[PDB]
């Protein structure tokens, strides 16, 4: 868990990496008692008894968001994240784990390694990590690689400095959509 949880760094919401961590003892009891993650939002399943619960395959969508963009990602509620960056479908059957990671992520002056789609050309699809930062074309002036009028580069610097408040700070989030139990003996 720690490997795909609190690592040296994470990814952005435009290129979130889903890690298949399965075929092992899924100890979520240790995650619950550690309680080092502000949010646990287990939507679809129970997070307290997730250890004993035996699934077939578990994911780990790894990405960082702001403290205001940590609410955006939601099964149903759409926004700059759940409609343009990382979409969470309503069939979510896993747990969204969120915690602030300024220490090993937020670089002073804003994180430049993290960039998020502020204006994705088309609408993002459920569970999609669009990596193409095509300039948004606003009706007229086709922005096919062109910049200027009606042209808005989607990928925008994710302002993440330790001086920033919690609402603009890197929230390391690994969501484990379930589709790997405890003792079972």
């Amino acid at each position, epitope marked *: 868990f720690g490997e795909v949880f609190n690592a*040296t760094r994470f990814a*952005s919401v435009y*290129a979130w990496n889903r890690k298949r961590i399965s075929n092992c003892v899924a100890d979520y009891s240790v995650l619950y008692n550690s309680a080092s993650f502000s949010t646990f939002k287990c939507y679809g399943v129970s997070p307290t008894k997730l250890n004993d619960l035996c699934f077939t395959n578990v994911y780990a969508d790894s990405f960082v968001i702001r403290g205001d963009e940590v609410r955006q990602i939601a099964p149903g509620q759409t926004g700059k994240i759940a409609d343009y960056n990382y979409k969470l479908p309503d069939d979510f059957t896993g747990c969204v784990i969120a915690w602030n990671s300024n*220490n*090993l992520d937020s*670089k*002073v*002056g804003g994180n*430049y*390694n993290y*960039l998020y789609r502020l204006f994705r050309k088309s609408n993002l699809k459920p569970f999609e990590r669009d990596i193409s*930062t095509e300039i948004y074309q606003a009706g007229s002036t086709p922005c096919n690689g062109v*910049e200027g009028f009606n042209c808005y*580069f989607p*990928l925008q*610097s994710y302002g993440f400095q330790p001086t920033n408040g919690v609402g603009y700070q890197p929230y390391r989030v690994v969501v484990l959509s379930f589709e790997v139990c405890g003792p079972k003996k």
Partner: antibody
Amino acid sequence: QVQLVQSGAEVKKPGASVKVSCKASGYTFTTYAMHWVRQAPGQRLEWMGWINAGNGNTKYSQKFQGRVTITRDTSASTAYMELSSLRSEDTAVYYCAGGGGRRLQFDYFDYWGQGTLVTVSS
Amino acid sequence: DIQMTQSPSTLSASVGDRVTITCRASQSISSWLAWYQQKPGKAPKLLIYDASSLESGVPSRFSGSGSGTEFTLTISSLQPDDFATYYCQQYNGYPWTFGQGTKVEIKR
């Protein structure tokens, strides 16, 4: 392999302005990471700045606030820089680098140009 | 600004040996560092980033360590290919500085 090449040796005079430039050789242009650094002869390396070879972003250093500028040309996909109001201390070797390539941005220097010589004399 | 001093300024070695390098930071760093090699009359090499990681294309001798403040560089055996200075770089925060410089020579 990604390669960086630039101009040659280059001798200026106090008060003048100077322009160094490097062409890139990138398998991808995925918000490439032009990122300049400096080297006073055999002493600390002191850092130049980074232009966003993706679109236009131009973040610079504090000690060189207000006198250094950088851009890039896209279809040439080269990057250029001014360097203005030159002075005697200013003599050094000038390095292109960057080229994150895999990821979108970094803050480390993984593809260096093999160097430019600037001599400020009277 | 982020302070950077490196010890010792110069060191000694002989072929087929281990040489320790320590990069000292005044103020706290979260594994924000890179190790570079510098041959005379040259453009720099990178071989450690992130205070641990070994970047591709390098001999396997090279190995970073440390976190927090004290940072350390390690090589097991000493090739002639190792005879150059070595610089440490922080990237915890703004304007990014370098070290002082740490060369090996040839003992006899």
